[PDB]
Amino acid sequence: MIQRTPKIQVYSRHPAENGKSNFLNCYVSGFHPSDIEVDLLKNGERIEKVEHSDLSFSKDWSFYLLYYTEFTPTEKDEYACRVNHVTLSQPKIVKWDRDM
Amino acid sequence: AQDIYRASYY
Amino acid sequence: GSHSMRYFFTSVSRPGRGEPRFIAVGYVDDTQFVRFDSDAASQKMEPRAPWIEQEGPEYWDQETRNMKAHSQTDRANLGTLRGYYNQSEDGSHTIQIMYGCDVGPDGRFLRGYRQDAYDGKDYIALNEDLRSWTAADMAAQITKRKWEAVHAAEQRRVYLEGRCVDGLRRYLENGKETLQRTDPPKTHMTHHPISDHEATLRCWALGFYPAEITLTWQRDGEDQTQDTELVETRPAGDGTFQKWAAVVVPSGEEQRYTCHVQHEGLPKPLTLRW
């Protein structure tokens, strides 16, 4: 059995603007197997009302999933995405950038 | 529409 | 132009925690439309598109059958493969099935697919001719020869040429406002200095469908493979997708690089500059 570590992208659904509703996205992909834990963060604290997409995979049989949350971007609050997976000894933290 | 999965045991 | 329908099935065995859990998903082109979760409460195939629920009760209790049967078949297959390589009942293993079909602009038939995988690695697949199969390992050879005995490729063929093209036709014309849509990528550039001598230009293409895309940075119109960075196309969380491409420019030379976006829901390929 071989295992693949997940790709991660942390991004807003629409171009950010302070005081305007956006939605925070963490996109993990290219991972195997499918058991993965994703939390999204406003200043280090776990956000609860985060849904996710339905489990699918690509041609190389590696899975992908998107987790999103309601959020209004400020300029003091900057959000993050934490992920744990069997390939990771420590959970990865990928903070959100306005322009990535 | 999906398949009438029937001849598909390993 | 052409269109697709794909069904992705993943069933992973939960040893100790009762029965295997089993997920399945349906896509038309890059647009999901149905869902089923073994851990779900409804225990019934649910809709995720707006056009698929105009199908009456003829259909939901139909596919729910077609796919609980597939679920138990995947369970027994998990056991069979557990025995096939002398593997231990303690481990958690996965089985995944992709199958579907393609149509042309006229709704013709060009291709059908069915591929199986055991723990991320390919197991058995049915070739483009819908006649023979390929076996990756030597256990997929026993599954293969057994399937040649009962002529399973002919049943996968009667499906792939039959109701897959019928369903794909019907869904293409039923979600006509939603499935033949596009979105000309809304593009915009970005400039971020790092040194007093270099900056980064990020060519942005947002809100586009289908996922197919091509971003290319050029210098004096010479294609640039050198100091670039290219994301994988990301779902924007609303049926449309995002992508960007960055390059590192010597300051004062920003206007020598050009981004070129090649989307097909778009008549002429773009060219952007600072």
Numbering used by the authors:
A (entry chain B): 0 to 99
B (entry chain C): 1 to 10
C (entry chain A): 1 to 274
Which passages does the manuscript contain on this structure?
The resulting peptide/MHC complexes (p/MHC) are further trafficked through the Golgi and eventually displayed on the cell surface, where they are surveilled by CD8+ cytotoxic T cells (CTLs) through specific interactions with αβ T cell receptors (TCRs). ProTECT analysis of 106 patient samples from the NBL TARGET cohort identifies a recurring “hotspot” mutation in the ALK protein (R1275Q), together with its specificity toward common HLA alleles. Specifically, two putative peptide sequences with the R1275Q mutation, a nonamer and a decamer, are predicted to bind HLA-B*15:01 with high affinity according to consensus methods.
Further characterization of the purified complex reveals a thermal stability of 47.9°C for the decamer and 46.7°C for the nonamer, suggesting that both ALK neoepitopes have a lower affinity for HLA-A*01:01 compared with HLA-B*15:01 (59.3°C), consistently with our binding energy calculations. The decamer complex crystallized in the P32221space group at a resolution of 2.9 Å. Inspection of crystallographic φ/ψ dihedral angles reveals that the peptide backbone also adopts a short 310 helix conformation when bound to HLA-A*01:01, suggesting that the peptide length is the main determinant of its conformation in the groove, and further justifying our fixed-backbone modeling approach. The peptide conformation in the X-ray structure shows excellent agreement with our Rosetta model (1.1 backbone heavy atom RMSD), with several high-resolution features predicted by the model are confirmed by the X-ray, including polar contacts within both the A- and F-pockets of the MHC groove. Moreover, comparison of the decamer peptide conformation when bound to HLA-B*15:01 versus HLA-A*01:01, two alleles that share 51% of groove residues according to a pairwise sequence alignment, shows only a modest change (1.6 Å backbone RMSD).
